[PDB]
Amino acid sequence: PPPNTKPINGESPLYQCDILDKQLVEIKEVNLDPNPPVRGENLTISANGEVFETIEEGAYIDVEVRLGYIRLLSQTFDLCETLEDNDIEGLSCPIEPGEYNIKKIVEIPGEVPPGKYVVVARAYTEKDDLITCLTGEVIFPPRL
Numbered sequence: 001p002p003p004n005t006k007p008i009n010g011e012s013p014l015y016q017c018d019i020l021d022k023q024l025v026e027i028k029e030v031n032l033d034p035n036p037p038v039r040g041e042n043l044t045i046s047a048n049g050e051v052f053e054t055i056e057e058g059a060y061i062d063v064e065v066r067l068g069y070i071r072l073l074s075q076t077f078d079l080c081e082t083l084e085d086n087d088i089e090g091l092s093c094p095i096e097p098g099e100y101n102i103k104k105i106v107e108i109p110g111e112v113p114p115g116k117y118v119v120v121a122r123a124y125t126e127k128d129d130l131i132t133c134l135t136g137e138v139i140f141p142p143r144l
């Protein structure tokens with residue numbers, strides 16, 4: 001994978017990107033229950049990380065999904081509102097420094113077209129300090 005990248009330990013395709021930029025959160029480990037995610041099935045996400053600065057209301061995530069060279073989805077999300085909506089282990093947004101472990105189950109839709117998808121997410125704080133940068137490639141087998 002590209003420059004300024006480091007693999008994330010665990011059963012996952014994720015890499016940390018922009019590694020030469022200090023990040024307020026370290027993602028130490030990530031594990032996916034069906035290791036290559038499968039369409040139409042549950043996906044269990046387990047993650048171990050560290051928070052070095054309090055993340056406050058107003059943080060946001062830039063998420064980009066790309067299919068080949070096509071910019072499929074590109075938008076920003078309210079970090080706190082998004083975490084609060086998806087019930088990630090009751091984590092209220094004021095995320096204090098410390099040791100975290102997360103377990104979340106999401107559903108991968110079966111209608112997703114087959115292909116090589118690349119995901120990139122950058123989370124920043126309200127004054128725009130880089131929280132973290134993650135990238136990953138997921139190939140869904142061509143049975144449409």
Ligand SMILES: CC(C)[C@@H](C)/C=C/[C@@H](C)[C@H]1CC[C@H]2C3=CC=C4C[C@@H](O)CC[C@]4(C)[C@H]3CC[C@]12C
Binds near residue numbers: 072
């Ligand atoms: C952790 C990552 C690497 C794993 C889970 C893979 C990402 C999946 C879930 C991503 C890859 C492409 C994404 C994707 C492609 C196309 C569409 C159609 C659009 O109208 C709504 C979003 C939607 C439905 C999203 C849903 C989430 C998908 C299917």
Ligand SMILES: *[C@@H]1O[C@H](CO)[C@@H](O)[C@H](O)[C@H]1NC(C)=O
Binds near residue numbers: 042105
């Ligand atoms: C998928 O997840 C839903 C809710 O998380 C659960 O009710 C269902 O039993 C799960 N099914 C499988 C096959 O894991």
